Nucleic acid binder design. Structure first.
Lengths: 330, 330
DNA sequence: GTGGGTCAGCGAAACGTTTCGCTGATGGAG
DNA sequence: CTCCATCAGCGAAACGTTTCGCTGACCCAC
């Protein structure tokens, strides 16, 4: 392929001038410009962003780490991120940690080695990035949730899972339910833990007891919700209602109840978390805690770009407001 | 941060030697190796993949284009691609065309400018990549669905949607249904069109009529299926069964029927397409045509890397095998 | 004319890595 | 002693792009 050097040779000029024509960053005469443009079209010049990135030390690339699965939540989140990147002139490199910590650190190292301009750290997993790696490479603008903790510098977005869990439970309490169970995510994941504590707080505040087996762990996926609900149906004291740690698990709950020939909400009332697209299409439609997903992706990018633009800003800190979407499940 | 040059200076050696220590590509004496390793740890050397890529003319990066949405199919596909990339030492750049053609071409140009080693072109929309762009940049290994015509040279995957649609309809015919409708995707998308033709073929072969309003278009999404089914419920002749273009649309169908207080399969039998994870958790569980998703992602990468490794090879053509999963919906 | 001054545009270095000729040392067959 | 054949490791070019110090062509107060 033709380089700016090949262009310059044919137009009989310096590569400096070729750069200036292309970038419009320093005055070049109309004649010279025309010659260069002719040479570009003639040779069919194919610019290398790679080579530009090396010299400029910026790639217009964002790296994103997630802990993804069949949970539709992350699909909507990624959609928002990718769209926002495109609109802002950035590429998206996607990494799935898949729970594994070495995998996560290996992903991170690759991203830093490829000199991404910014980082979305949206892993849920307990682990935090090897500081060895972190402090080896130049610091980059970073956004993370309160999900994954971390010792370095980053802008922060808090999901307020605790208030969400409280709100969800409080809603069931306000509907008059007193036997309320909680299907949670893996308790080593912060959002799962916080939602459980929200549930506990609302129950305690209303003086309602939590039977021994009323808190059950699932995996934040369909199957986890299925398994957990089956277990709950074994309990001596049948729940009137269940708060599931997310919408994915609620899908599994629906399936368990279908198999047990139980109706929602007539036999059991259900409330989820996330308000994924699917929630609205469930039968009955799922009452749930709305959290930003696509919108969250867009917000995280906006934060990240603000910092790229103004590198010396103080730490940015945002919080989401959980909101209840009332439908037919509770 | 330290470069291989800084390392070389401290260890008092050539950068050639430093490269050889790091890459293990030519013999270096044990003493030299040790000194270099010490220098690496001492300076805390941070390798640049950027700089390596420029010199090597390879980025160990794959670009992937999809026409994504809420459709869970693409979530599972991307998961397979990303995992396969990771296992093979590649990064994944993800692009969503969102149907738009200029957006698609803009994505392509960025990827080529960043010199990705390979392309996964898994857009459903009909447009062809601007040849201007294509023939401007160095040609790269490419895998695409056998949907769009000649469009340069690249490896191909046939999904066998036509035989799938035929099989799905034939199944309903074999269950004794005679009034069978078809909810399809946008007919400008090849898999949607092919599935419709499959339906037509099976109907014709059995000599069953297709009433005028029995073929309805939606977008390959929950709400497309919802809208399309509502329309079908308006038809003077109510269908006994419906083949939906994919599982996403079947979700919408379920929701429409729920609102019309109609039961599956008692009032209407339903059969979908992808066998997404969710299919088996639906109420009732969805009868559908299985096709590879995660496994498709893995296969596409394997093909792409085989070509990177052996550029000599002539066009690969792979075919997927649809499998019918009989469940409770039909 | 004419010595001095302005700025377009020159040649070319260099972001950090891989690759390449080249050399000097060492090793066995005279 | 020759000398001839191998390879370890050096110094540094160079992938393709910006960026810099310098020049020289043209305008202008003498």
């Amino acid at each position: 392929s033709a380089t700016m050097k090949d262009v310059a040779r044919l137009a009989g000029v310096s590569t400096s001038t070729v750069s200036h024509v292309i970038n419009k960053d320093r005055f070049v005469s109309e004649a010279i410009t025309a010659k260069v443009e002719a040479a570009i079209k003639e040779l069919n010049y194919a610019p290398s962003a790679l080579a530009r990135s090396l010299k400029l030390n910026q790639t217009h690339t964002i790296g994103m780490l997630i802990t993804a699965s069949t949970n539709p939540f992350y699909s909507e989140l990624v959609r928002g991120v990718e769209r926002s990147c495109f609109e802002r002139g950035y590429s998206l490199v996607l990494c799935n940690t898949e729970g594994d910590e070495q995998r996560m650190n290996r992903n991170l190292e690759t991203l830093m080695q490829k000199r991404v301009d910014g980082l979305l750290l949206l892993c849920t997993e307990t682990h935090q990035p090897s500081r060895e790696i972190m402090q080896r490479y130049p610091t980059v603008p970073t956004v993370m949730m309160d999900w994954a903790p971390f010792d370095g510098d980053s802008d922060l977005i808090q999901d307020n899972s605790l208030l969400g869990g409280d709100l969800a439970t409080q809603y069931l309490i306000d509907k008059g339910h007193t036997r309320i169970a909680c299907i949670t995510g893996p308790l080593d994941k912060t959002p799962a833990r916080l939602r459980l504590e929200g549930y506990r707080a609302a129950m305690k505040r209303a003086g309602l007891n939590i039977p021994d087996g009323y808190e059950v762990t699932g995996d934040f996926e369909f199957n986890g919700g299925f398994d957990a609900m089956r277990q709950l149906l074994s309990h001596p004291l049948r729940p009137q209602a269940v708060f599931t740690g997310n919408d994915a698990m609620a899908v599994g709950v629906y399936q368990a109840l279908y198999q047990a020939e139980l109706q929602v909400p007539q036999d059991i009332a259900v409330i989820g978390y996330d308000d994924i697209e699917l929630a609205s299409f469930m039968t009955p439609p799922l009452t749930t805690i709305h959290q930003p997903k696509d919108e969250l992706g867009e917000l995280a990018i906006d934060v990240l770009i603000h910092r790229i633009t103004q590198p010396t800003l103080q730490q940015q800190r945002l919080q989401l407001t959980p909101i209840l979407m009332e439908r037919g499940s509770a």
